[PDB]
Short mmCIF file of C-alpha atoms and ligand atoms in Angstrom, two decimals:
data_model
loop_
_atom_site.label_atom_id
_atom_site.label_comp_id
_atom_site.label_asym_id
_atom_site.label_seq_id
_atom_site.Cartn_x
_atom_site.Cartn_y
_atom_site.Cartn_z
CA UNK V 1 29.33 20.72 5.61
CA UNK V 2 27.31 20.06 2.37
CA UNK V 3 24.45 18.82 4.56
CA UNK V 4 23.28 21.53 6.96
CA UNK V 5 21.89 20.73 10.48
CA UNK V 6 18.34 21.00 11.72
CA UNK V 7 16.09 20.20 14.66
CA UNK V 8 16.82 17.14 16.82
CA UNK V 9 13.30 16.97 18.28
CA UNK V 10 11.59 16.99 14.84
CA UNK V 11 14.02 14.22 13.88
CA UNK V 12 12.90 12.21 16.91
CA UNK V 13 9.29 12.06 15.60
CA UNK V 14 10.65 11.15 12.12
CA UNK V 15 12.62 8.22 13.57
CA UNK V 16 9.74 7.12 15.81
CA UNK V 17 7.26 7.02 12.89
CA UNK V 18 9.58 5.99 10.05
CA UNK V 19 12.52 3.95 11.51
CA UNK V 20 11.68 2.49 14.96
CA UNK V 21 9.58 -0.40 13.53
CA UNK V 22 12.88 -1.91 12.42
CA UNK V 23 15.61 -0.04 14.34
CA UNK V 24 16.75 0.66 17.93
CA UNK V 25 19.42 3.33 18.65
CA UNK V 26 20.49 2.77 22.27
CA UNK V 27 23.62 0.95 23.56
CA UNK V 28 23.46 -2.85 23.36
CA UNK V 29 20.00 -2.57 21.77
CA UNK V 30 18.39 -5.60 20.02
CA UNK V 31 18.28 -6.29 16.28
CA UNK V 32 14.66 -6.29 15.01
CA UNK V 33 13.84 -6.31 11.24
CA UNK V 34 16.91 -4.07 10.96
CA UNK V 35 20.19 -3.81 12.96
CA UNK V 36 20.94 -1.73 16.04
CA UNK V 37 22.19 1.66 14.84
CA UNK V 38 24.24 2.65 17.88
CA UNK V 39 27.70 3.65 16.72
CA UNK V 40 26.68 3.70 13.04
CA UNK V 41 28.62 6.92 12.34
CA UNK V 42 32.33 6.28 11.77
CA UNK V 43 31.63 2.60 11.21
CA UNK V 44 31.71 0.72 7.90
CA UNK V 45 28.50 -0.65 6.36
CA UNK V 46 27.61 -4.20 7.29
CA UNK V 47 29.65 -4.45 10.51
CA UNK V 48 27.14 -4.75 13.39
CA UNK V 49 27.84 -8.19 14.88
CA UNK V 50 24.99 -10.59 15.61
CA UNK V 51 22.99 -9.44 12.56
CA UNK V 52 22.73 -11.19 9.17
CA UNK V 53 23.11 -8.66 6.35
CA UNK V 54 22.79 -9.15 2.60
CA UNK V 55 26.06 -9.51 0.62
CA UNK V 56 25.37 -6.12 -1.00
CA UNK V 57 25.46 -4.10 2.28
CA UNK V 58 28.81 -5.63 3.33
CA UNK V 59 30.35 -5.46 -0.21
CA UNK V 60 29.47 -1.75 -0.51
CA UNK V 61 31.85 -1.05 2.43
CA UNK V 62 31.38 2.68 3.03
CA UNK V 63 32.28 4.54 6.23
CA UNK V 64 29.00 6.09 7.40
CA UNK V 65 29.31 9.86 7.48
CA UNK V 66 26.53 12.45 7.53
CA UNK V 67 26.81 12.99 3.74
CA UNK V 68 26.66 9.45 2.28
CA UNK V 69 23.92 8.69 4.81
CA UNK V 70 21.81 11.56 3.43
CA UNK V 71 22.37 9.93 0.00
CA UNK V 72 21.21 6.56 1.36
CA UNK V 73 18.01 7.75 3.05
CA UNK V 74 16.96 9.47 -0.19
CA UNK V 75 16.81 6.15 -2.09
CA UNK V 76 18.25 2.91 -0.45
CA UNK V 77 17.93 0.63 -3.47
CA UNK V 78 19.73 3.14 -5.76
CA UNK V 79 22.65 3.59 -3.31
CA UNK V 80 23.12 -0.09 -2.31
CA UNK V 81 21.50 -2.29 -5.03
CA UNK V 82 20.14 -5.54 -3.59
CA UNK V 83 19.57 -4.30 -0.01
CA UNK V 84 16.57 -5.73 1.86
CA UNK V 85 15.74 -2.43 3.63
CA UNK V 86 12.11 -2.10 2.45
CA UNK V 87 11.97 1.69 2.58
CA UNK V 88 10.51 4.46 0.42
CA UNK V 89 12.90 7.30 1.11
CA UNK V 90 13.12 10.79 2.59
CA UNK V 91 12.56 13.00 -0.44
CA UNK V 92 12.63 16.31 1.41
CA UNK V 93 16.04 17.68 2.44
CA UNK V 94 14.65 19.29 5.62
CA UNK V 95 13.53 15.83 6.83
CA UNK V 96 16.98 14.40 5.99
CA UNK V 97 18.81 17.10 7.99
CA UNK V 98 16.39 16.78 10.94
CA UNK V 99 16.85 12.99 11.16
CA UNK V 100 20.64 12.97 10.66
CA UNK V 101 21.01 15.55 13.47
CA UNK V 102 18.90 13.39 15.81
CA UNK V 103 20.70 10.18 14.77
CA UNK V 104 24.05 11.94 15.42
CA UNK V 105 22.87 12.49 19.02
CA UNK V 106 21.11 9.16 19.63
CA UNK V 107 23.95 7.00 18.26
CA UNK V 108 26.96 8.54 20.14
CA UNK L 1 -33.74 -8.98 -19.88
CA UNK L 2 -30.05 -9.80 -19.13
CA UNK L 3 -27.87 -7.75 -16.72
CA UNK L 4 -26.98 -4.10 -17.43
CA UNK L 5 -24.22 -3.74 -20.04
CA UNK L 6 -21.65 -1.13 -19.06
CA UNK L 7 -19.89 -0.08 -22.26
CA UNK L 8 -16.55 1.70 -21.81
CA UNK L 9 -16.63 5.09 -23.50
CA UNK L 10 -13.31 6.95 -23.61
CA UNK L 11 -13.53 10.63 -22.62
CA UNK L 12 -13.63 12.90 -25.73
CA UNK L 13 -10.28 13.28 -27.50
CA UNK L 14 -8.15 11.89 -24.64
CA UNK L 15 -5.28 9.40 -24.94
CA UNK L 16 -2.28 7.97 -22.94
CA UNK L 17 -0.52 11.33 -22.34
CA UNK L 18 -3.64 12.94 -20.80
CA UNK L 19 -3.95 10.08 -18.27
CA UNK L 20 -0.15 10.07 -17.58
CA UNK L 21 -0.55 13.70 -16.43
CA UNK L 22 -3.34 12.65 -13.97
CA UNK L 23 -1.15 9.79 -12.68
CA UNK L 24 1.72 12.34 -12.30
CA UNK L 25 -0.57 14.69 -10.32
CA UNK L 26 -1.64 11.95 -7.87
CA UNK L 27 2.03 10.77 -7.54
CA UNK L 28 3.57 14.13 -6.71
CA UNK L 29 0.84 14.95 -4.18
CA UNK L 30 1.50 11.51 -2.62
CA UNK L 31 5.15 12.59 -2.29
CA UNK L 32 4.17 16.07 -0.97
CA UNK L 33 1.66 15.12 1.75
CA UNK L 34 3.74 12.33 3.28
CA UNK L 35 2.83 13.46 6.83
CA UNK L 36 -0.55 11.70 6.82
CA UNK L 37 -1.30 8.97 9.34
CA UNK L 38 1.96 9.09 11.36
CA UNK L 39 3.99 9.30 8.17
CA UNK L 40 2.46 6.30 6.35
CA UNK L 41 1.19 8.69 3.68
CA UNK L 42 -1.93 8.47 1.51
CA UNK L 43 -0.62 5.48 -0.47
CA UNK L 44 -2.51 2.69 1.41
CA UNK L 45 -5.89 4.51 1.77
CA UNK L 46 -5.93 5.03 -2.01
CA UNK L 47 -5.54 1.32 -2.90
CA UNK L 48 -8.24 0.54 -0.30
CA UNK L 49 -10.46 3.17 -2.03
CA UNK L 50 -9.91 1.62 -5.47
CA UNK L 51 -10.92 -1.75 -4.00
CA UNK L 52 -13.97 -0.68 -1.93
CA UNK L 53 -15.54 1.08 -4.95
CA UNK L 54 -14.87 -1.97 -7.15
CA UNK L 55 -15.72 -4.43 -4.37
CA UNK L 56 -19.46 -3.71 -4.48
CA UNK L 57 -19.74 -5.65 -7.77
CA UNK L 58 -22.17 -8.54 -8.03
CA UNK L 59 -21.55 -10.83 -11.00
CA UNK L 60 -25.16 -12.10 -11.11
CA UNK L 61 -26.89 -8.85 -12.17
CA UNK L 62 -23.87 -6.62 -12.92
CA UNK L 63 -24.84 -4.05 -10.27
CA UNK L 64 -22.12 -2.17 -8.44
CA UNK L 65 -18.52 -1.97 -9.54
CA UNK L 66 -16.11 0.80 -10.48
CA UNK L 67 -17.95 1.96 -13.65
CA UNK L 68 -20.61 4.20 -12.14
CA UNK L 69 -18.36 6.33 -9.94
CA UNK L 70 -21.16 6.04 -7.39
CA UNK L 71 -18.94 6.60 -4.32
CA UNK L 72 -19.48 10.38 -4.70
CA UNK L 73 -23.10 9.83 -3.54
CA UNK L 74 -24.13 9.95 0.16
CA UNK L 75 -25.41 6.35 0.56
CA UNK L 76 -22.15 4.68 -0.56
CA UNK L 77 -20.00 7.54 0.82
CA UNK L 78 -21.50 7.00 4.30
CA UNK L 79 -21.32 3.16 4.20
CA UNK L 80 -19.97 2.00 7.66
CA UNK L 81 -17.36 -0.25 5.98
CA UNK L 82 -16.20 2.77 3.93
CA UNK L 83 -15.21 4.68 7.14
CA UNK L 84 -11.83 6.41 6.62
CA UNK L 85 -12.01 6.63 2.81
CA UNK L 86 -13.28 10.25 3.11
CA UNK L 87 -9.58 11.16 3.50
CA UNK L 88 -8.88 9.38 0.22
CA UNK L 89 -11.73 11.19 -1.63
CA UNK L 90 -10.53 14.53 -0.15
CA UNK L 91 -6.99 13.89 -1.50
CA UNK L 92 -8.48 13.15 -4.93
CA UNK L 93 -10.85 16.14 -5.29
CA UNK L 94 -8.30 18.97 -5.94
CA UNK L 95 -6.94 16.99 -8.90
CA UNK L 96 -10.54 16.36 -10.09
CA UNK L 97 -10.84 20.18 -10.40
CA UNK L 98 -7.52 20.29 -12.30
CA UNK L 99 -8.84 17.54 -14.62
CA UNK L 100 -12.72 17.95 -14.74
CA UNK L 101 -13.00 15.74 -17.85
CA UNK L 102 -12.10 12.50 -16.04
CA UNK L 103 -14.97 10.37 -14.72
CA UNK L 104 -15.15 9.54 -10.99
CA UNK L 105 -14.69 5.79 -11.53
CA UNK L 106 -11.58 6.35 -13.66
CA UNK L 107 -10.14 8.64 -10.97
CA UNK L 108 -10.72 6.35 -7.91
CA UNK L 109 -9.34 3.28 -9.73
CA UNK L 110 -6.39 5.31 -11.15
CA UNK L 111 -5.50 6.49 -7.63
CA UNK L 112 -5.14 2.85 -6.59
CA UNK L 113 -3.02 1.95 -9.63
CA UNK L 114 -0.85 5.05 -9.00
CA UNK L 115 -0.49 4.26 -5.28
CA UNK L 116 0.79 0.72 -5.79
CA UNK L 117 3.33 1.57 -8.51
CA UNK L 118 4.72 4.52 -6.52
CA UNK L 119 5.10 2.31 -3.44
CA UNK L 120 7.58 0.18 -5.47
CA UNK L 121 4.98 -2.41 -6.41
CA UNK L 122 4.36 -4.18 -9.74
CA UNK L 123 3.33 -2.27 -12.88
CA UNK L 124 -0.42 -2.68 -13.19
CA UNK L 125 -2.17 -2.20 -16.62
CA UNK L 126 -5.05 0.28 -16.47
CA UNK L 127 -7.95 0.96 -18.89
CA UNK L 128 -10.08 4.08 -19.24
CA UNK L 129 -13.70 4.51 -20.24
CA UNK L 130 -15.78 4.39 -17.04
CA UNK L 131 -18.80 6.71 -17.15
CA UNK L 132 -20.67 8.44 -14.30
CA UNK L 133 -24.17 6.98 -13.74
CA UNK L 134 -27.14 8.56 -11.79
CA UNK L 135 -27.98 8.43 -8.06
CA UNK L 136 -30.41 5.51 -8.53
CA UNK L 137 -27.69 3.07 -9.67
CA UNK L 138 -25.88 3.50 -6.31
CA UNK L 139 -25.37 0.10 -4.51
CA UNK L 140 -27.02 -0.42 -1.13
CA UNK L 141 -24.71 -0.87 1.88
CA UNK L 142 -23.51 -4.29 3.01
CA UNK L 143 -21.71 -5.67 -0.06
CA UNK L 144 -18.19 -5.31 1.42
CA UNK L 145 -16.53 -8.08 3.51
CA UNK L 146 -16.53 -8.45 7.30
CA UNK L 147 -13.28 -9.07 9.21
CA UNK L 148 -14.51 -11.30 12.07
CA UNK L 149 -14.98 -14.36 9.83
CA UNK L 150 -13.39 -17.65 8.61
CA UNK L 151 -12.00 -19.28 5.40
CA UNK L 152 -15.39 -20.61 4.34
CA UNK L 153 -16.71 -17.00 4.32
CA UNK L 154 -13.75 -15.55 2.33
CA UNK L 155 -14.13 -18.25 -0.38
CA UNK L 156 -17.89 -17.75 -0.79
CA UNK L 157 -17.61 -13.91 -0.70
CA UNK L 158 -14.98 -13.68 -3.44
CA UNK L 159 -16.98 -16.01 -5.71
CA UNK L 160 -19.32 -12.97 -6.19
CA UNK L 161 -16.37 -11.02 -7.65
CA UNK L 162 -15.42 -14.00 -9.88
CA UNK L 163 -12.19 -14.57 -7.87
CA UNK L 164 -10.62 -18.04 -7.36
CA UNK L 165 -8.32 -19.25 -4.49
CA UNK L 166 -5.14 -17.85 -6.07
CA UNK L 167 -6.69 -14.43 -6.84
CA UNK L 168 -7.92 -13.81 -3.28
CA UNK L 169 -4.61 -14.75 -1.56
CA UNK L 170 -2.78 -12.38 -3.96
CA UNK L 171 -5.30 -9.53 -3.41
CA UNK L 172 -5.07 -10.06 0.36
CA UNK L 173 -1.34 -9.34 0.09
CA UNK L 174 -2.16 -5.62 -0.27
CA UNK L 175 -2.57 -5.77 3.52
CA UNK L 176 1.25 -5.38 3.60
CA UNK L 177 0.32 -1.69 3.27
CA UNK L 178 -0.97 0.55 6.05
CA UNK L 179 -2.85 -0.43 9.18
CA UNK L 180 -6.17 -0.95 10.92
CA UNK L 181 -7.63 2.04 12.80
CA UNK L 182 -9.93 1.41 15.76
CA UNK L 183 -11.94 4.61 15.06
CA UNK L 184 -12.77 3.32 11.55
CA UNK L 185 -13.14 -0.47 11.78
CA UNK L 186 -12.83 -1.63 15.38
CA UNK L 187 -9.36 -3.19 14.91
CA UNK L 188 -5.91 -1.75 15.70
CA UNK L 189 -2.33 -2.06 14.46
CA UNK L 190 -0.25 -2.88 11.34
CA UNK L 191 0.10 -6.18 9.41
CA UNK L 192 3.81 -5.49 8.82
CA UNK L 193 6.75 -3.12 9.33
CA UNK L 194 7.03 -1.68 5.78
CA UNK L 195 3.53 -0.09 5.84
CA UNK L 196 4.13 2.04 2.69
CA UNK L 197 6.38 -0.14 0.51
CA UNK L 198 4.70 -2.91 -1.48
CA UNK L 199 6.32 -6.26 -0.59
CA UNK L 200 5.39 -9.89 0.22
CA UNK L 201 5.84 -9.36 4.01
CA UNK L 202 2.14 -10.14 4.73
CA UNK L 203 2.80 -13.82 3.91
CA UNK L 204 6.22 -14.01 5.67
CA UNK L 205 4.66 -12.50 8.81
CA UNK L 206 1.68 -14.89 8.59
CA UNK L 207 3.69 -18.10 9.08
CA UNK L 208 6.99 -16.93 10.64
CA UNK L 209 5.53 -14.95 13.58
CA UNK L 210 3.91 -16.31 16.75
CA UNK L 211 0.23 -15.35 16.84
CA UNK L 212 -2.06 -15.08 19.89
CA UNK L 213 -5.80 -14.26 19.77
CA UNK L 214 -6.55 -11.27 22.03
CA UNK L 215 -9.23 -8.60 22.56
CA UNK L 216 -8.63 -4.95 21.54
CA UNK L 217 -10.25 -1.78 22.99
CA UNK L 218 -13.34 -2.17 20.74
CA UNK L 219 -13.98 -5.66 22.20
CA UNK L 220 -13.20 -7.29 18.82
CA UNK L 221 -10.95 -10.35 18.54
CA UNK L 222 -7.67 -10.01 16.61
CA UNK L 223 -4.41 -12.02 16.23
CA UNK L 224 -1.40 -10.26 17.74
CA UNK L 225 2.38 -10.91 17.53
CA UNK L 226 5.14 -10.13 20.05
CA UNK L 227 6.71 -7.79 17.49
CA UNK L 228 3.65 -5.51 17.58
CA UNK L 229 1.81 -6.67 14.42
CA UNK L 230 -1.81 -7.83 13.93
CA UNK L 231 -3.96 -10.04 11.68
CA UNK L 232 -7.73 -9.95 11.12
CA UNK L 233 -9.76 -13.18 11.50
CA UNK L 234 -10.07 -13.30 7.69
CA UNK L 235 -6.31 -12.78 7.21
CA UNK L 236 -5.22 -15.64 9.51
CA UNK L 237 -7.87 -17.86 7.84
CA UNK L 238 -5.35 -18.02 5.01
CA UNK L 239 -3.05 -20.37 7.00
CA UNK L 240 -5.88 -22.37 8.61
CA UNK L 241 -7.26 -23.53 5.25
CA UNK L 242 -5.00 -26.15 3.51
CA UNK L 243 -5.71 -24.80 -0.01
CA UNK L 244 -4.92 -21.19 0.95
CA UNK L 245 -1.82 -22.20 3.00
CA UNK L 246 -0.06 -23.64 -0.10
CA UNK L 247 -0.42 -20.39 -2.05
CA UNK L 248 0.67 -18.31 1.00
CA UNK L 249 3.98 -20.31 1.23
CA UNK L 250 4.43 -19.87 -2.55
CA UNK L 251 4.14 -16.09 -2.20
CA UNK L 252 6.37 -15.97 0.89
CA UNK L 253 9.21 -17.67 -1.08
CA UNK L 254 8.70 -15.93 -4.44
CA UNK L 255 7.93 -12.18 -4.47
CA UNK L 256 8.02 -11.95 -8.28
CA UNK L 257 5.23 -14.57 -8.49
CA UNK L 258 3.16 -12.56 -5.97
CA UNK L 259 3.82 -9.34 -7.94
CA UNK L 260 2.66 -10.83 -11.26
CA UNK L 261 -0.36 -12.49 -9.62
CA UNK L 262 -1.47 -9.35 -7.73
CA UNK L 263 -1.38 -7.23 -10.91
CA UNK L 264 -3.64 -9.47 -13.00
CA UNK L 265 -6.03 -9.90 -10.04
CA UNK L 266 -6.15 -6.18 -9.22
CA UNK L 267 -6.63 -5.21 -12.87
CA UNK L 268 -9.47 -7.76 -13.00
CA UNK L 269 -10.95 -6.27 -9.78
CA UNK L 270 -10.92 -2.71 -11.14
CA UNK L 271 -12.29 -3.77 -14.52
CA UNK L 272 -15.11 -6.06 -13.25
CA UNK L 273 -18.51 -5.44 -14.87
CA UNK L 274 -17.22 -3.31 -17.73
CA UNK L 275 -17.46 -4.26 -21.41
CA UNK L 276 -14.58 -2.88 -23.47
CA UNK L 277 -15.31 -2.61 -27.24
CA UNK L 278 -12.93 -3.91 -29.95
CA UNK L 279 -12.08 -0.35 -31.05
CA UNK L 280 -11.08 0.61 -27.47
CA UNK L 281 -7.32 1.17 -26.83
CA UNK L 282 -5.12 -1.57 -25.33
CA UNK L 283 -4.28 -1.08 -21.56
CA UNK L 284 -2.02 1.73 -20.34
CA UNK L 285 1.19 1.06 -18.42
CA UNK L 286 2.27 4.32 -16.75
CA UNK L 287 5.73 5.70 -16.11
CA UNK L 288 6.56 6.14 -12.43
CA UNK L 289 8.07 9.36 -11.04
CA UNK L 290 11.41 7.55 -10.50
CA UNK L 291 11.32 6.54 -14.20
CA UNK L 292 10.89 10.24 -15.17
CA UNK L 293 13.97 11.12 -13.09
CA UNK L 294 12.10 12.35 -10.00
C1 ZNH T 301 14.52 5.48 8.99
C2 ZNH T 301 14.31 6.70 8.41
C3 ZNH T 301 15.66 4.66 8.86
C4 ZNH T 301 17.01 4.90 8.94
C5 ZNH T 301 17.73 6.06 9.64
C6 ZNH T 301 17.67 3.69 8.50
C7 ZNH T 301 19.05 3.47 8.48
C8 ZNH T 301 19.75 2.29 8.18
C9 ZNH T 301 21.20 2.16 8.03
C10 ZNH T 301 22.28 3.25 8.21
C11 ZNH T 301 21.40 0.87 7.66
C12 ZNH T 301 22.74 0.23 7.36
C13 ZNH T 301 23.18 -0.62 8.55
C14 ZNH T 301 24.65 -1.03 8.50
O1 ZNH T 301 25.22 -1.30 9.58
O2 ZNH T 301 25.23 -1.10 7.41
C15 ZNH T 301 20.08 0.25 7.58
C16 ZNH T 301 19.78 -1.08 7.31
C17 ZNH T 301 18.61 -1.83 7.30
N1 ZNH T 301 17.41 -1.31 7.62
ZN1 ZNH T 301 17.05 0.70 7.84
N2 ZNH T 301 16.75 2.72 8.19
C18 ZNH T 301 15.52 3.28 8.44
C19 ZNH T 301 14.26 2.53 8.35
C20 ZNH T 301 14.02 1.17 7.98
C21 ZNH T 301 12.72 0.57 7.96
C22 ZNH T 301 11.38 1.35 7.90
C23 ZNH T 301 12.93 -0.76 7.83
C24 ZNH T 301 11.99 -1.76 8.13
C25 ZNH T 301 11.29 -2.40 7.17
C26 ZNH T 301 14.40 -0.92 7.67
C27 ZNH T 301 15.11 -2.15 7.61
C28 ZNH T 301 16.50 -2.34 7.58
C29 ZNH T 301 17.13 -3.56 7.23
C30 ZNH T 301 16.38 -4.87 7.16
C31 ZNH T 301 18.48 -3.26 7.01
C32 ZNH T 301 19.62 -4.14 6.51
C33 ZNH T 301 20.04 -3.84 5.07
C34 ZNH T 301 20.84 -4.96 4.42
O3 ZNH T 301 20.82 -5.05 3.18
O4 ZNH T 301 21.45 -5.77 5.14
N3 ZNH T 301 15.02 0.27 7.74
N4 ZNH T 301 19.11 1.13 7.88
C1 ZNH T 302 -11.79 -10.63 3.23
C2 ZNH T 302 -11.29 -9.43 2.75
C3 ZNH T 302 -10.99 -8.17 3.37
C4 ZNH T 302 -11.35 -7.60 4.58
C5 ZNH T 302 -12.34 -8.07 5.65
C6 ZNH T 302 -10.68 -6.33 4.73
C7 ZNH T 302 -10.77 -5.51 5.84
C8 ZNH T 302 -10.07 -4.34 6.10
C9 ZNH T 302 -10.20 -3.60 7.29
C10 ZNH T 302 -11.13 -3.93 8.47
C11 ZNH T 302 -9.29 -2.60 7.15
C12 ZNH T 302 -9.02 -1.46 8.13
C13 ZNH T 302 -9.71 -0.12 7.89
C14 ZNH T 302 -9.29 0.92 8.89
O1 ZNH T 302 -8.80 1.98 8.46
O2 ZNH T 302 -9.42 0.67 10.10
C15 ZNH T 302 -8.61 -2.75 5.89
C16 ZNH T 302 -7.59 -1.97 5.37
C17 ZNH T 302 -6.98 -2.02 4.15
N1 ZNH T 302 -7.41 -2.90 3.17
ZN1 ZNH T 302 -8.43 -4.61 3.53
N2 ZNH T 302 -9.89 -6.04 3.66
C18 ZNH T 302 -10.10 -7.16 2.78
C19 ZNH T 302 -9.56 -7.21 1.48
C20 ZNH T 302 -8.74 -6.25 0.87
C21 ZNH T 302 -8.32 -6.29 -0.52
C22 ZNH T 302 -8.82 -7.37 -1.52
C23 ZNH T 302 -7.52 -5.14 -0.72
C24 ZNH T 302 -6.93 -4.58 -1.89
C25 ZNH T 302 -6.41 -5.20 -2.99
C26 ZNH T 302 -7.48 -4.45 0.56
C27 ZNH T 302 -6.72 -3.31 0.86
C28 ZNH T 302 -6.64 -2.62 2.08
C29 ZNH T 302 -5.65 -1.57 2.42
C30 ZNH T 302 -4.42 -1.16 1.56
C31 ZNH T 302 -5.87 -1.20 3.71
C32 ZNH T 302 -5.04 -0.20 4.51
C33 ZNH T 302 -5.68 1.19 4.45
C34 ZNH T 302 -4.99 2.24 5.31
O3 ZNH T 302 -4.08 1.91 6.11
O4 ZNH T 302 -5.36 3.42 5.17
N3 ZNH T 302 -8.25 -5.10 1.53
N4 ZNH T 302 -9.10 -3.81 5.24
#
């Protein structure tokens, strides 16, 4: 596709250092600062039950595919204005590919 | 004889655009070397640098402070409470070679200002004019604060920096950034989850989490939470003291109030002990990388 595909093991260290403080990826996993991301691909934004999202994340209503997700992790506040995901952003494309390929694996 | 008067002298023929290019150099390098400290980046160590070199000020005889740029000297560089800031100085030196005209004080304080703005924080006004001073003006070790203390200590310590109750609570909110390293200070773990984005989480975590006093692997006593976070004895002293508690709740509810309060307090911290003439330019507000389209 437009996004390539990288290393799944490099993307594991990227998640563990940069996403795991707030997110879990396994089946039936608990909601921490952020929601459980299992089954995030092919699902619409703001649909994980049991978690309280902002009105902006639900109103955006985009089906999470590998491309719009790469756009989101670049700059969260520019993609979904008003989101409470306190995150800087993955500015390097290699790091975006590496993490999306690991997330693809970890979340079904 | 009165204290020493440190008059701000702007570096020969330099203006806003020359300093914007130094800011831009620190900001891009911050974006480039984002691998540092398990991906936290160099953002937090730089604000800590800007504070530890300004934090040696003593209002009574005007010794210490950011002006001198005295952190480049071995006595202040090897101060036990300055452990870990070598990494911050090492990040700053290649850009000191690219811009040899800028004084050390101006560079360390600029790095802090750059670090906070780039981490989505408030825009903090910065003034130039600090001048390098000799090896003999270098402050003796022991002027920085200890972590294993109470509210009475914090209040008396910050009086030396001319900071009131509101200023200290705001400044302490910078602890929303980074972590404590056992190898450096004897304490371990983060204060929050967003360790490289400037937010008011420090205050929300202080009163919304369940804290238990435990012992770490350096035998020091720190407050831990079930969610994996930590607080220093000086940090939790902010909810034990009734006067500090009120301001903490105010910052936990209103981030914009924290943002505006941090900026005036931090600018005051960086500028402490410096006398700016009437002819000197009005403070610089720099354009972030995101504001330049990057
Ligand atoms: C790490 C690199 C991270 C991601 C991968 C990632 C992804 C992610 C997605 C796809 C969502 C949308 C969820 C939905 O079902 O619509 C989302 C949401 C929220 N997140 Zn994150 N995220 C990564 C990291 C972080 C970090 C470091 C934090 C912790 C401070 C964080 C937090 C949250 C959060 C509170 C979310 C809800 C957003 C909303 O407005 O409701 N994320 N993430
Ligand atoms: C009382 C008082 C006080 C005290 C005791 C302290 C202490 C501290 C300690 C111990 C540490 C750790 C180190 C290591 O590495 O290990 C830190 C860090 C710190 N810090 Zn902080 N602080 C303080 C204040 C402060 C202020 C005021 C500021 C600013 C504004 C700061 C900023 C800081 C930072 C940002 C950090 C992080 C860094 C990193 O991570 O690198 N800080 N501290």
